[PDB]
Design an enzyme around this catalytic site. Sequence first.
Site, short mmCIF file in Angstrom:
data_model
loop_
_atom_site.label_atom_id
_atom_site.label_comp_id
_atom_site.label_asym_id
_atom_site.label_seq_id
_atom_site.Cartn_x
_atom_site.Cartn_y
_atom_site.Cartn_z
CD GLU A 34 -3.13 -0.66 0.20
OE1 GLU A 34 -2.98 0.34 -0.53
OE2 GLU A 34 -4.13 -1.37 0.18
CG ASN A 56 -8.68 6.24 -3.69
OD1 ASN A 56 -9.04 6.55 -2.54
ND2 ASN A 56 -7.72 5.34 -3.93
CG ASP A 113 -13.46 7.68 -4.62
OD1 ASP A 113 -12.37 8.20 -4.37
OD2 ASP A 113 -13.97 6.96 -3.78
CB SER A 125 -11.58 9.18 -1.79
OG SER A 125 -11.13 7.98 -2.42
CG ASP A 147 -6.36 5.44 -0.80
OD1 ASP A 147 -7.52 5.50 -0.32
OD2 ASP A 147 -6.11 4.89 -1.88
CG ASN A 202 -11.10 5.47 1.77
OD1 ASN A 202 -12.09 6.22 1.88
ND2 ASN A 202 -11.19 4.16 1.93
CG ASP A 251 -16.71 -1.49 8.63
OD1 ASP A 251 -17.67 -1.32 9.44
OD2 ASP A 251 -16.61 -0.93 7.51
#
EC number: 3.2.1.17
Length: 129
Positions: free
Chosen positions: A35, A46, A48, A50, A52, A59, A101
């Site tokens: 990562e 990202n 979208d 967003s 990270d 994110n 989660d």
Amino acid sequence: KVFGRCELAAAMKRHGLDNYRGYSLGNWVCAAKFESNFNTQATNRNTDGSTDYGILQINSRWWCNDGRTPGSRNLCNIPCSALLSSDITASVNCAKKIVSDGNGMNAWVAWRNRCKGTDVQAWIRGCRL
């Protein structure tokens, strides 16, 4: 800060990720490698829009607030910039929340595509833990 492999192993262990919800430490280290390459300052957009952030590429869409992710949540209640500190405390705790989660470490796409199904123990080989 760019962590050494075992230096991060040890920090991760000290913070309680080893076997956390059953993920051995090598999983956390492998994920961190693919990562951020172990670099706390890592950031990546990202598609979208967003971003990270940090050692575990957490994110702005769901977990941290970066002031520019429209309609995002901040479920760890932290500025995303907190996640770039050489102190991994906020990332580690936020990662605990993520992993708990429902989807486990699959929330990390690098882990899913690069660590899962592999001998993740190799990522802490040689480490004094």
